Assembly symmetry: C3
Homo-oligomer: 356 residues x 3
């Protein structure tokens, strides 16, 4: 039969901490939807405080994959900091490699989040606001050394598309950028991508391809990068290194995945002396929903939540199945149906409130 | 197991009447997709003839909900009438309230429906036309007394967005307006929303926020508000009050709903001396289809149709299961699969033709 | 219970041939999603070499349907040839008929495919490239004799929409053109349709409606008409007539279909001395995915592959169930789950590599 076997774990820190140790694992005997298989991928993300006075974080990521025998790699190292409550800045470098090909880059970017409104009538009356509409502005400057024949070729293609295309370049680049079903997923999350504005495009003197470009993306409220702008970057809680790792193996007969992290932001002040496990980000559910409906499956799942010592759940919906002091478990019944729901694209709230 | 239990009833008036008494009830042990739960909502709609000579209808609606403990209310009272076969006019007032907040409004609007074509080649050859492409133009003037700090604040935000945004205001307002997955649902129904054109925005003298704005929406044929413009407002059949009521209760473990109404338009002349139960509106099926695929379910359903005395079904597909004179019932087999189909987004025709 | 019963067959030619005899049949006891039923349709397509020196193909198609008792017919005869590796030309004629109505047409068109990039870094490292982004330009000149009242009426409507609409005509025509859920399907495949540009619209002297119009369509890589431009027209392999036939019967209780063809392009050089059955086109899967999720179903399927004499499979994923020399069969297990997957919108690769 078709069965999804999964295990999730949440271990929460108490006091003034929002930190949690999270774990996930799943295996399902269904094909992945990728038109090129097998596909294996590993991701690691680390965030460490560089300067707590200026709120500078050193964010490092490494992604390695094998897709239909092609070996890929992305490495990135970036310094991130808020400048204002709406403007964040990033300065970094990295390298992208595919088989016998590689290219290096350096960049500087500013990202400005703009909520469409501010209302005390909403703030006073909605205890847990979810959908928050807005638009977010990117201004990117990037540099790539044109140190091989392939980089020269692609740079020349962009020179032709930018000069030839005119107003069409910034418009038509969107379907090049959002390759395959990444394009389809834009509308799926109530998201919009503006045309690209080219401020600078040129070759510096070996030769270096230089560019400065801008775009905005917007959301009707599902887009967490906009609705939860401050929360998604919990620099104020980063008093030590945080890290997350994920990995999957897939082919036309199965998918297997494991995630483990230790990071701030797992819990949040819910008000009235209560705390919550953070609201589930909506984009992962909505996007995974585009693949989660291709095969009927039974659910064999368990969630384990371990609160800090002397703390207890005050409200849980779906209700936990069993308890032993600070440890709570969810399996079968209502929780298994919620698991099926969210794997298929559902965004139905699973809420956990705790205190003491 | 996961089971959808539902009951539907249709009681038809005969002679020159298109009226029917409709009833629906359903319960399913699945979470709702709302990222904020529990959520309960009740709706009541009434339409009464004010002036049959001018074809003026008094349309009143009241919606009350509780979402994650927040109490909401919408009350609206409107005078509606056709001016031409394409232009309808509406003059009304209402109130929107959320928790400790409330605001009143008055409005005047004109809505012009424009079918993209008229063809006798289509009219002569298609006995039951469904997809009809068109565009529909709204021209709205609205007034809100700015009688609290919140209204002043929001009005000021709109003053900044309208003057600052310029051409961007009418464009970017769409993702603010179609909150969360309402934005996603636009494309889902083959629907389009034009940018908003601001004709007037200002403060009148307490202070009153005044605005006049325009937009058009279009459809490729699924949009019933366009394809079935005259049919959706059966003023010619409104010789007495019509009314409909609906209510639901939902949380992360279940959904329960009941609908009951007595209204014209339930049956329609099918031609050749036959009558049909009206074609199923496509938008409800297509939109509910965005939530109906999150959990596998078994179907426990029944539809009961009661024709007027001495009338009989001449054709039914899916075929009814049983009959007793003017009463017909559908359950199990083909009908249960059609029920599953339409709950998931399917628009497959279920046709009932009757006469005598 | 709900069961999809299907049988597929592939018989491959060897040596320098890419030709294959393909067969498909399926029956499922579910309603079709069409809001007008019953619906039966037959299609026949033939391609024959007219001139191998100029690479001219005579492509003929005939489509006949009955939808809710309305009898329809489309007949087309066209001369197609590549002019360059990016530009193809078509010159043809046909007739569209619905019930008591009919109209004839003649046309000339050029279609220019434009891949967004060319990269040797991609070519050297990706053994089987799938997503290829691009845009494709249509330039159509068409003529219809206005020999009945209906043609005069529609021509007059277009005269009003073109002169009245101005810039709006080319924009709003898209929802008229992509009737019903054809509009929704555009975004679904990561596809874009540009506004129509009208170069010529007029009446010639009986009266003939004349028009010249242009549009482009683009894809993020799922759009096979763009990604696989040369492959979808295998003129170099057309040394004799190729033909395909398909037919379906559907209503609110069932769907039944059969396809049979004999055509080039069924196999392709995979490199390294290996051959593959061609990559599955993504658009059919993605589009059928919009209807394939409305009813849970069990899978009763078989695929039979017959290689040319002395050839063997070197790799198959999902793995074949059984073998007897050059004959291989897939049924149950992993293949049945892949069948369920692709019927619901999944694009997960099923790969067959063979040699000798
Ligand atoms: C298909 C399954 C669903 C899903 C199903 C569930 C379920 C079921 C539960 C949670 C729970 C939680 N999930 Mg979730 N969740 C998804 C994806 C996300 C993402 C994300 C960035 O993608 C985030 C930030 C979260 C966040 C959270 C917290 C709100 C919460 C506690 C952590 C936990 O138990 O994790 C468990 C870890 C996982 C489910 C692993 C998810 C891995 C995702 C799919 C990303 C894999 C990326 C891969 C390794 C690399 C991709 C590389 C690119 C190809 C380049 N989820 C995916 C899409 N999630 C729990 C909760 O609500 O507690 C109150 C809970 O019970
Ligand atoms: C995802 C939705 C939005 C988006 C939302 C945001 C948000 C929100 C932010 C940025 C930020 C930035 N974005 Mg942006 N961004 C988008 C698309 C782009 C594209 C592109 C070509 O598509 C580019 C070039 C950029 C460029 C940039 C840089 C200017 C800057 C830092 C990026 C970086 O370091 O990434 C390197 C990172 C990776 C390669 C992996 C990231 C994987 C995912 C996204 C991580 C989620 C967190 C995970 C669940 C938990 C991590 C825990 C660890 C313990 C830390 N964005 C899309 C349209 N972007 C950030 C910034 O610093 O601005 C100044 C910022 O705050
Ligand atoms: C934000 C995007 C990342 C990036 C991410 C990747 C990834 C991921 C991949 C490549 C790959 C390729 N990249 Mg790179 N690449 C960047 C910058 C560059 C620059 C440059 C001078 O800035 C050049 C010449 C190249 C060149 C190339 C090709 C040689 C190579 C294969 C074709 C292709 O898919 O191109 C894709 C080209 C781009 C993504 C960006 C090109 C930028 C141009 C030249 C200048 C700016 C144009 C405009 C203002 C902004 C465009 C925004 C992007 C569409 C997101 N990249 C930056 C640092 N690039 C692929 C590869 O290795 O294949 C074997 C691959 O998988
Ligand atoms: C999920 C289930 C499907 C659905 C499944 C079925 C089934 C199954 C049957 C019909 C049947 C009919 N339906 Mg239907 N139908 C839906 C929604 C609609 C809507 C609408 C405005 O939403 C309309 C006008 C109709 C109209 C009709 C008639 C064509 C026909 C006879 C009435 C009847 O039996 O009703 C029964 C009543 C219902 C199914 C209740 C539907 C309630 C919908 C979901 C709206 C609830 C709104 C809620 C109370 C308030 C929302 C407030 C906002 C949040 C602010 N349906 C929903 C989306 N319908 C029958 C038929 O074809 O007869 C020939 C039949 O057998
Ligand atoms: C729904 C698809 C279209 C749409 C289609 C139509 C159609 C069609 C008509 C209007 C009408 C109007 N619309 Mg409009 N309209 C849309 C979006 C809007 C928006 C907005 C901010 O989104 C606004 C402000 C308006 C504004 C207006 C007013 C000018 C006018 C009367 C509205 C009213 O009284 O509602 C108060 C009503 C409610 C709060 C509840 C309505 C719930 C649903 C929509 C009712 C369906 C009927 C139900 C199944 C059966 C009822 C039976 C009873 C016995 C009567 N429309 C969307 C884009 N609109 C009507 C008019 O009079 O024009 C002059 C008209 O005929
Ligand atoms: C057609 C839309 C309805 C309407 C429906 C609702 C609903 C439903 C809700 C609110 C809520 C709010 N409304 Mg109101 N509201 C209208 C008219 C107004 C006017 C005005 C002077 O005309 C003002 C100042 C306000 C102000 C406010 C906020 C104080 C409040 C919380 C923020 C928010 O969501 O705003 C939303 C603001 C709007 C929907 C319209 C603002 C119109 C502006 C000021 C003038 C016209 C601008 C432009 C020409 C047209 C915009 C079209 C709309 C986007 C649909 N509304 C009209 C009568 N409003 C929410 C609330 O109570 O939260 C606690 C809430 O749930
Ligand atoms: C719903 C089912 C899926 C589907 C499921 C499968 C399965 C399962 C298998 C293949 C296989 C193959 N399919 Mg497929 N396939 C679909 C549609 C397509 C289309 C197309 C133009 O629509 C093409 C070109 C192909 C091509 C191919 C080859 C890559 C491969 C070998 C041929 C074969 O076995 O065919 C079998 C024939 C069919 C499945 C019939 C498909 C008929 C489609 C739905 C079109 C019917 C049109 C109708 C008659 C007329 C419409 C008229 C309009 C209304 C005007 N498929 C549909 C959408 N296909 C096999 C493979 O991968 O081998 C390695 C395999 O095992
Ligand atoms: C499908 C995605 C694209 C598209 C992709 C392409 C591609 C790719 C090509 C054309 C070609 C042409 N297109 Mg175009 N075209 C689109 C929409 C249109 C529309 C429209 C009103 O929507 C029009 C008027 C045209 C017009 C034209 C003509 C200029 C020309 C020949 C058409 C013809 O003979 O069809 C008559 C055909 C039919 C009525 C049936 C076709 C059914 C499907 C599409 C066939 C698939 C092949 C099947 C799986 C296997 C066949 C095997 C046989 C043994 C041959 N296109 C959409 C947006 N078009 C071709 C050309 O010659 O250009 C110069 C060409 O190469
Ligand atoms: C590429 C499109 C095909 C075509 C495919 C079909 C199909 C399929 C159907 C009709 C049907 C109709 N067609 Mg025809 N039709 C074409 C050309 C024409 C021309 C013309 C002088 O060129 C005229 C006057 C007509 C007229 C008509 C109507 C009398 C009739 C019913 C209304 C309707 O759906 O119209 C649809 C009208 C069109 C599809 C095209 C009209 C073109 C106009 C007059 C001139 C060009 C305008 C602009 C530059 C380009 C528009 C592109 C299209 C939107 C795809 N067609 C060409 C050859 N037509 C329907 C029917 O028989 O109903 C009983 C039907 O099912």
């Amino acid at each position: 039969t078709t069965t999804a076997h999964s295990d999730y774990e949440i271990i929460l820190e108490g006091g003034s901490s929002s930190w949690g140790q999270i774990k996930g694992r799943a295996k399902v005997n269904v094909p992945a939807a990728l038109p090129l298989l097998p596909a294996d991928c590993n991701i690691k993300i680390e965030a460490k405080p560089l300067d707590a006075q200026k709120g500078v974080v050193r964010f490092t990521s490494q992604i390695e994959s094998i897709v239909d025998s092609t070996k890929n790699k992305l490495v990135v190292e970036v310094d991130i900091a808020n400048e204002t409550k709406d403007r964040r800045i990033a300065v970094g470098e990295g390298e992208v490699s595919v088989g016998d090909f590689s290219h290096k880059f350096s960049f500087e970017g500013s990202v400005v989040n703009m909520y469409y409104y501010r209302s005390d009538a909403v703030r006073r009356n909605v205890p847990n606001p979810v959908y928050m509409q807005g638009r977010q502005f990117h201004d990117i400057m990037m540099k790539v050394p044109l140190d091989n024949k392939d980089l020269i070729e692609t740079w020349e293609g962009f020179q032709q598309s930018i000069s030839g295309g005119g107003v069409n370049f910034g418009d038509w680049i969107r379907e090049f950028w959002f390759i395959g079903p990444a394009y389809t997923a834009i509308n799926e999350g109530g998201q919009r991508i503006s045309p690209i504005q080219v401020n600078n495009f040129g070759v510096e003197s070996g030769p270096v391809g230089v560019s400065r470009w801008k775009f905005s993306h917007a959301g009707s409220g599902i887009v967490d990068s906009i609705s939860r702008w401050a929360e998604l970057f919990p620099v104020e809680q980063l008093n030590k290194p945080a890290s997350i790792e994920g990995g999957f193996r897939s082919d036309s007969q199965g998918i297997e995945v494991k995630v483990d992290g230790n990071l701030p932001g797992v819990s949040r002040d819910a008000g009235g002396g209560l705390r919550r496990i953070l609201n589930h980000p909506l984009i992962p559910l909505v996007h995974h929903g585009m693949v989660g409906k291709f095969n009927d499956f039974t659910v064999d799942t368990q969630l384990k939540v371990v609160l800090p010592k002397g703390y207890k759940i005050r409200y849980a919906a779906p209700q936990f199945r069993s308890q032993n002091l600070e440890e709570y478990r969810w399996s079968g019944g209502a929780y298994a149906r919620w698991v099926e729901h969210v794997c298929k694209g559902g965004t139905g709230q699973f809420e956990v409130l705790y205190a003491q």
